[PDB]
Amino acid sequence: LMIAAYKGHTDVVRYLLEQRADPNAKAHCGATALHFAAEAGHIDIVKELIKWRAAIVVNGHGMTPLKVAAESCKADVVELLLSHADCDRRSRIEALELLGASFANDRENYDIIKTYHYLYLAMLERFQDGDNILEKEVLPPIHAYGNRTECRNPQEL
């Protein structure tokens, strides 16, 4: 099922899940099916496993399937994983921020307008209510990336 999800062959994985196979299959690195599915940007395979409730679990490298999807600029599987009926704000905003980050520096998927728009969407959804607000836990500045200190306000963004 893992190599079916990594490849684009949705028929093989849908037949495998039609046989009542294990969706919570742990791997050596912790990647459980959806991590391979939402790495090649296969939206239909991810839908097939969410239909069978493959569940979201953090792998060995500290990455959810949603964060794995957002790491590789694959926006559609990010959309599908953001509607899991248990996603929470903190994960949703960190996924949107990760997607905007990934769109900034990549060979295949390089859009700077998508970078700004997804960062602004995550910032607006951060500072949307004014109550139980989710302020950014900004890391200390790093000399490699100039001397910037992220963007803790929508005005500086």
Partner: peptide
């Protein structure tokens, strides 16, 4: 010669 174009789990992606 275009450093950007020069850029570019192997045992796990085996069948």
């Amino acid at each position: 010669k275009k450093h950007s174009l020069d850029l570019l789990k192997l045992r796990h992606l085996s069948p």
